[PDB]
Amino acid sequence: GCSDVSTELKTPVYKTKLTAEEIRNSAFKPEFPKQYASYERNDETTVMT
Amino acid sequence: RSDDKKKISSHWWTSPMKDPEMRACRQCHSDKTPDYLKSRVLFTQKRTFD
Amino acid sequence: GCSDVSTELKTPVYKTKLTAEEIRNSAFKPEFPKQYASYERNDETTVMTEYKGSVPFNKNDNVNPLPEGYRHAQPYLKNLWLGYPFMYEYREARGHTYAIQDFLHIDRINRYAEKGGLPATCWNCKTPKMMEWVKESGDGFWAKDVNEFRDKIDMKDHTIGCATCHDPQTMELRITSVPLTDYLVSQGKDPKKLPRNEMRALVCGQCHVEYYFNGPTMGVNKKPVFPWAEGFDPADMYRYYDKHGDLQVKGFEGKFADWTHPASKTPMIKAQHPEYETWINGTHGAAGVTCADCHMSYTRSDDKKKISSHWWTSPMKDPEMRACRQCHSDKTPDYLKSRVLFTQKRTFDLLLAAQEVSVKAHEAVRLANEYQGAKAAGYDDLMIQAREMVRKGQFFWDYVSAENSVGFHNPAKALDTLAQSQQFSQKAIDLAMEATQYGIGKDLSGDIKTIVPPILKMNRKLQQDPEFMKTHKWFQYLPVLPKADQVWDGQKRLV
Amino acid sequence: AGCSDVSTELKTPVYKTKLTAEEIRNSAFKPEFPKQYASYERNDETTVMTEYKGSVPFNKNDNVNPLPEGYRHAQPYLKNLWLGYPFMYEYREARGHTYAIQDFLHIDRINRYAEKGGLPATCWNCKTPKMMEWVKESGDGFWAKDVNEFRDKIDMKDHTIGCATCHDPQTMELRITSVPLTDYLVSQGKDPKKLPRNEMRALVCGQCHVEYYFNGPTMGVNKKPVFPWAEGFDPADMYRYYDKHGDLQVKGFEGKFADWTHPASKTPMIKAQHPEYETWINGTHGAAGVTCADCHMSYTRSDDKKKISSHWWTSPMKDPEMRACRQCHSDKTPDYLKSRVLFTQKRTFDLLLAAQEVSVKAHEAVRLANEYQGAKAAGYDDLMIQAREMVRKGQFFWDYVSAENSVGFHNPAKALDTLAQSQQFSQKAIDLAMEATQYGIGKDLSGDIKTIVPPILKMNRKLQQDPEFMKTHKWFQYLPVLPKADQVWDGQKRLVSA
Amino acid sequence: FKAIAGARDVYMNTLGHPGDLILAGMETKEVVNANCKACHTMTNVEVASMEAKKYCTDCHRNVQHMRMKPISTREVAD
Ligand code: HEC
Ligand code: HEC
Ligand code: HEC
Ligand code: HEC
Ligand code: HEC
Ligand code: HEC
Ligand code: HEC
Ligand code: HEC
Ligand code: HEC
Ligand code: HEC
Ligand code: HEC
Ligand code: HEC
Ligand code: HEC
Ligand code: HEC
Ligand SMILES: CCCCCCCCCCCCO[C@@H]1O[C@H](CO)[C@@H](O[C@H]2O[C@H](CO)[C@@H](O)[C@H](O)[C@H]2O)[C@H](O)[C@H]1O
Ligand SMILES: [Ca+2]
Ligand SMILES: [Ca+2]
Ligand SMILES: [Ca+2]
């Protein structure tokens, strides 16, 4: 029969709305809210090992 | 695996020992407990600091 | 064709090499090294969360840094527990591996006499050694002095451990508690045939509960009882304590008291860690979500096979919140954290405000008790009523303050209980001013922190010093204690 | 039997109507959308009650009379706490959107015994899609006109809250027609025309179900509606906003906002209005992105086998089967879901009444301290300012919860926390007023507040004309006896000539 | 199973009147759950994960079609 692996693994490609010279962090937050929300964890400054 | 259960790359650049379950280490070292791995880290660091 | 599902899922069945009466933790380590390794994690005592954590700081101390005090502390605890053993020492709870170590360092128990002044019931939730001790002395165990068993126990091998919850031979879950078994029987429940989802909370409900000790005329002297007959809410327990007790004081006849506050002269109830009763009708409890679900979550640490976590600690210590994230797989860990704090931040602020009005209620009742001016015609009946409201006010904020989740187990019950606590305390103030025709008003004007300062330092040793006993106006309602050397230091007698 | 895979993009169905760009008549949508329309017509049901809410527009202060005049759960002190404010005349339980204009034109809050209603035309803002024509015609000068100017210039059924409020009449795409919400969105740097679908499924409601105020003459465009959202959505945030924005010249309150001065205590008050949106946004459902439409516009498969959004906007509790909820909570019985709603509601409503009681007592304490004839404390003037600040803060905090329509369910922890703080503020007002008078007012504050200051059950614009009725309660002494006057307006019908 | 399930699903889509809530029966709750165990035995072998909760999805709730997510992420008008 047919495979039900309908979703194939591909290396993500990205084309954003940002300019070649964009350097503001806040500008990236609309396009990548997951990685941005991850980046925000670096604000934690209370934990020692 | 924090977007449902899909992977993202962690952009939290910090000590790997902050995770009690050492998940960064436990794919390569799946045969070792978090506790074991942590003790091996400390085995080096404590002698290094002293 | 065939299945390659050659390994079939079966509920694990155990047959150990242990005797039916094994209680030493170390005896289980060879049989179960994975769960034992998990259990040893409770030795971590360095990590704080926002409101909780495993550093045993002093709960009234917001002045000193860790591990002495913390930024989130309740400054008025010694004031509010004046004349009770909790005015001596009261620390943040830490891991089960420390239960006996902490028991034996605590100043609540007298260490400046042979006798501790507390019953042997204090051991009830600290050691599986409770099974031998009760077998041996029966009903007579409870009213023994706590210090009689102080040197008859191994701090480490006999702390809360495997036999507390497990049959050593079969490893099936067990209720070993006397008072929890008493409660279950009273409900027509068989403690040996409890459904599994119920067991996964009841095992914790052996100890994480509100309790009291029988007085001499209440049943077996000093036997522990859970006051759960009227229901689980604060108003229910309050009502329970109206009906069961031994007080002879006018206006309070037959009610329960743990002590009477020496400033206000109010018959008080003490609340202790009511996690079970708080949890049971909160959003998770009522939905069948259990202590073990969050606090003993499955952890894939044996290669990739699940075991049950035996590290009983804050679920917030895992930055990835893995306990929560099967049920809440759609939410990020940090979202879940922000939602816990949404509750905790508000619960904690409200609590400090409830405790401040309670101190003022005690201070208003104190002033009205010692009033020399013209009193109302109904003064006596108004002072009874004011004391009833101090008592009820304190019990309500204490039911919340004592509970370890800072409102998360039951956000609505906690916030509502504190809102009510304020009402009762303020009404004590209103009745105390009416009783004195507003004559005490001048004495109640300031910030309460100025007219009754928080008591930061108080221990059994300092209560021996006659010049320290002059440093606060509430100290005059306490006796200066006889000069006495420390008798006990942990398990050693001192020479 | 079937071949291509599902698309994951969840493309919404697309429409092209025969309606013109500016069509606002509800009946014009009926021919093309009969299922949504018939569902909309279900808002006419005005008989069903729930435990705390429902559709009978009873008097919210009346716990004495039976339905439809009163109800077992009512707040007896509302007219006392809103003394000197239009809300003291009439304030009823909200009902279906289809009655919005009918109820607007019968309410005693708007003066019907003069030409002028005494309220700005801004009052039409969340009542009718006619707002678009009306603002286009007058612009900035629309807001400060008298409300009665438009009274005869509306169809009460064709121009109520309806399709054009939330939908582009040509494409039926969700739309924000609200001026003050657009002003807020633009202030946050958002494009109102390009918002995601999950945002819009709550924002269409946030056009109206919000706390608002009207500008004073020196605050910008006069009488223009503004959402006090710049400091955040919480009660403490809005209160802070109202400390920085406003126009009072009264000593101790310079530059703060006030809706009225309570004539008994002489406190400058803020009035709160139905903040569903601000309450929902950070509650357990809203924080999780569960929108107003998830529970209030649940998918229904009534006609054919085709599902549409329900457009019966009412209490979810009316449904014995709780279907809206079980689209998510499929593992819970309807019975369990209702008990968890009531877990919150009962506690919230009981604590509300207690907060209102201490609020009444704080007004009384400040009134007595104001009229006090004995020796006053040395810092009296400063203590009275503080006391009135606490009365004002305390009341805004309970009003924030009181006015919100889910009785704590949209945000349980915010509701109970806000009510707990309220009680603290009002009590501190009482404490400061006592101090100002060296406890000389103490004996006047001794009983149950219900016998000290009786609830005011009856009050309207007709009765305030009667000088014998105006001796019927102690607090009436602080109100004028209104001139004797015939009713000018009966609904839309004019009885006396201009 | 496929034939019986297909028959009643065809009937409900043609001559039946499905409600606003479509939910699984006891029959399908029990077959889905047995299939969780068929592919995930090894994760669960050393643990009593079948004993407390009746179904695997009582903990793995969103495996049941992401039911806790906002409606718009799942649903549109017909
Ligand atoms: C700042 C806030 C950001 C944002 C929004 C993103 N990045 Fe990074 N990133 C870095 C590395 C080494 C990787 C893995 C690359 C690889 O192995 O191919 C990434 C990955 C990403 C992604 C891809 C998706 C994913 O989660 O894998 C995206 C969308 C992304 N990032 C966005 C390295 C860095 C940095 C080095 C110090 C810094 C700074 C950032 N990234 C910052 C950001
Ligand atoms: C996460 C922070 C960790 C920790 C704590 C450790 N590892 Fe690794 N590891 C990897 C490889 C290739 C080696 C060399 C052995 C080999 O060739 O197979 C190691 C070695 C170690 C050790 C032993 C040396 C020591 O310092 O004691 C220890 C204690 C150790 N590791 C701990 C491979 C990987 C990974 C794959 C890409 C990753 C990820 C890690 N290791 C991460 C960690
Ligand atoms: C069943 C009746 C129980 C018992 C006996 C306990 N819990 Fe919980 N718990 C949960 C969360 C998110 C917290 C806050 C953690 C933090 O603030 O860092 C707690 C807290 C506790 C404590 C205090 C822990 C500490 O750090 O000292 C204790 C002693 C405790 N709980 C016992 C989460 C949950 C649940 C998830 C929904 C459930 C169910 C329970 N807890 C139930 C119980
Ligand atoms: C977004 C889709 C919504 C939702 C979910 C609700 N509304 Fe409104 N509403 C408005 C007015 C003026 C009233 C009172 C009308 C009257 O009393 O005559 C209401 C009433 C309600 C209710 C109560 C219904 C009941 O049966 O009790 C409910 C549940 C409700 N609303 C929810 C005003 C507006 C608008 C102004 C133009 C807009 C837009 C909305 N509401 C949108 C929504
Ligand atoms: C988005 C911000 C909104 C808006 C504008 C409203 N809701 Fe809800 N709502 C829900 C429940 C269980 C109740 C209680 C009903 C009852 O007790 O009978 C309510 C109540 C309301 C009202 C009052 C209804 C009335 O009878 O007048 C209004 C006007 C209202 N809501 C509007 C359920 C939910 C949700 C489910 C989780 C969500 C999300 C919302 N509501 C969000 C909103
Ligand atoms: C007047 C009675 C109408 C008519 C004829 C329609 N609407 Fe509405 N609608 C609103 C919301 C939030 C949605 C969901 C949008 C989404 O999920 O993306 C809808 C949906 C519709 C549709 C689309 C088909 C469907 O049934 O889902 C159609 C054709 C439709 N409606 C027609 C919000 C509102 C309102 C805000 C308060 C008001 C008013 C109306 N709708 C009124 C009407
Ligand atoms: C190629 C060699 C790989 C790799 C690198 C991984 N897989 Fe699989 N896998 C499958 C199933 C059903 C499970 C769950 C079993 C259970 O729940 O008991 C897994 C498990 C994993 C894991 C986690 C466990 C571990 O051993 O570390 C990992 C890291 C993993 N896989 C990666 C299903 C399949 C396949 C379908 C027939 C195939 C092919 C693979 N897996 C192959 C691989
Ligand atoms: C019924 C027998 C099942 C089946 C078939 C599975 N589970 Fe669970 N599970 C629970 C928790 C807290 C975790 C996380 C542990 C960790 O992160 O280390 C898991 C994990 C899984 C997986 C791995 C999935 C993944 O995200 O990688 C799988 C395949 C799995 N389980 C299957 C919690 C629970 C329960 C709560 C008490 C119950 C019941 C189950 N699991 C039961 C089952
Ligand atoms: C390191 C650079 C990795 C490579 C290359 C691949 N994976 Fe991975 N994987 C990695 C980590 C650090 C984790 C842990 C994620 C977490 O949140 O814990 C994973 C996880 C998985 C899983 C889930 C396994 C489990 O713990 O249950 C699977 C099924 C998985 N990875 C598969 C997988 C495949 C098929 C890969 C090739 C394309 C692959 N991984 C690459 C690290 C790394
Ligand atoms: C009596 C025998 C107990 C049983 C059964 C359970 N708990 Fe307990 N717990 C008990 C004590 C006496 C203490 C404090 C001991 C100390 O040395 O301070 C605790 C502590 C906890 C904590 C705090 C851990 C920390 O902060 O690191 C937690 C989170 C906790 N207990 C949870 C818990 C759960 C979930 C239980 C059921 C399985 C449970 N405990 C059982 C006493 C007893
Ligand atoms: C296993 C991982 C699943 C796959 C693959 C699919 N579904 Fe599912 N489905 C699953 C569960 C755990 C449940 C809930 C069962 C219970 O105990 O209640 C369901 C339920 C349904 C339903 C209706 C009920 C509902 O909750 O929505 C339908 C109509 C359904 N399932 C159909 C369906 C289809 C068409 C799938 C392929 C695209 C499919 N399911 C995949 C688990 C799993
Ligand atoms: C399944 C067994 C669960 C686990 C483990 C956790 N939660 Fe949970 N959660 C669960 C249910 C059944 C509910 C009620 C809603 C429902 O679907 O019936 C919830 C609710 C919450 C909420 C919202 C309520 C609130 O008080 O804020 C939050 C914030 C929440 N849950 C968080 C949370 C955390 C932090 C957990 C681990 C420590 C956790 N949940 C575990 C089911 C389950
Ligand atoms: C949007 C920002 C509004 C403005 C501006 C005004 N009203 Fe309103 N109204 C609005 C909502 C969301 C509701 C239902 C919620 C509720 O709690 O009532 C209402 C309700 C009414 C009613 C009927 C209920 C009642 O109070 O008796 C009337 C008569 C009414 N509104 C009139 C009115 C007046 C006089 C206004 C100016 C002072 C006014 N509204 C402004 C939304 C909004
Ligand atoms: C406070 C109660 C408690 C204590 C103390 C305790 N356990 Fe457990 N234990 C549980 C619960 C609850 C479970 C899961 C029960 C279930 O689902 O049947 C469990 C599970 C287990 C299991 C089954 C395998 C697994 O990981 O789920 C073993 C084996 C076990 N415990 C051994 C131990 C050992 C060894 C110790 C001492 C170091 C110990 N227990 C202490 C409550 C406890
Ligand atoms: C008419 C002559 C008949 C003789 C047979 C020759 C024609 C039929 C063969 C067509 C070739 C495709 O063959 C087909 O490959 C896919 C893989 O992509 C397999 O698919 C298999 O693996 C995938 C995962 O990789 C699973 O999703 C699937 O459940 C499983 O069945 C099919 O089970 C197999 O049948
Ligand atoms: Ca702790
Ligand atoms: Ca007690
Ligand atoms: Ca209503």
Side-chain angles (χ1 to χ4, degrees), chain C residues 287-307:
Chain C
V289 176
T290 246
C291 321
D293 291 353
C294 297
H295 284 275
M296 294 197 61
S297 73
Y298 297 136
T299 177
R300 292 183 313 130
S301 63
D302 182 12
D303 293 335
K304 257 69 175 308
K305 287 167 291 176
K306 288 167 159 171
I307 71 153

Side-chain angles (χ1 to χ4, degrees), chain D residues 4-8:
Chain D
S4 67
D5 207 11
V6 282
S7 173
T8 231

Side-chain angles (χ1 to χ4, degrees), chain D residues 256-291:
Chain D
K256 303 193 172 212
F257 188 84
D259 289 288
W260 83 114
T261 295
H262 198 281
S265 51
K266 328 286 174 185
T267 308
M269 308 303 297
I270 318 151
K271 182 79 182 69
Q273 282 94 359
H274 46 246
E276 281 79 54
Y277 192 83
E278 301 104 311
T279 301
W280 160 91
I281 193 147
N282 62 4
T284 111
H285 285 102
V290 176
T291 66

Side-chain angles (χ1 to χ4, degrees), chain D residues 53 57-58 60 85-87 90-95 97 100 103-110 119-120 122-127 147 161 180 205-214 225 227 273-274 276 402-405:
Chain D
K53 306 294 297 176
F58 73 86
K60 307 205 88 184
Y85 195 63
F87 274 80
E90 198 169 12
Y91 172 58
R92 286 146 111 239
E93 163 71 23
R95 58 165 176 185
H97 288 150
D103 288 340
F104 187 73
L105 301 165
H106 285 301
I107 211 74
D108 208 51
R109 302 211 292 277
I110 296 165
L119 285 170
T122 313
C123 289
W124 290 97
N125 192 68
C126 312
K127 297 297 177 275
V147 59
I161 300 151
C205 319
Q207 294 184 109
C208 304
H209 282 273
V210 302
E211 153 62 355
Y212 66 89
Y213 68 92
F214 303 152
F227 299 170
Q273 282 94 359
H274 46 246
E276 281 79 54
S402 173
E404 208 268 354
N405 285 278

Side-chain angles (χ1 to χ4, degrees), chain C residues 313-327:
Chain C
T313 192
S314 161
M316 304 273 269
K317 269 160 172 211
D318 175 11
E320 296 314 298
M321 306 281 275
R322 303 169 140 111
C324 319
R325 281 213 64 242
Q326 296 332 288
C327 285

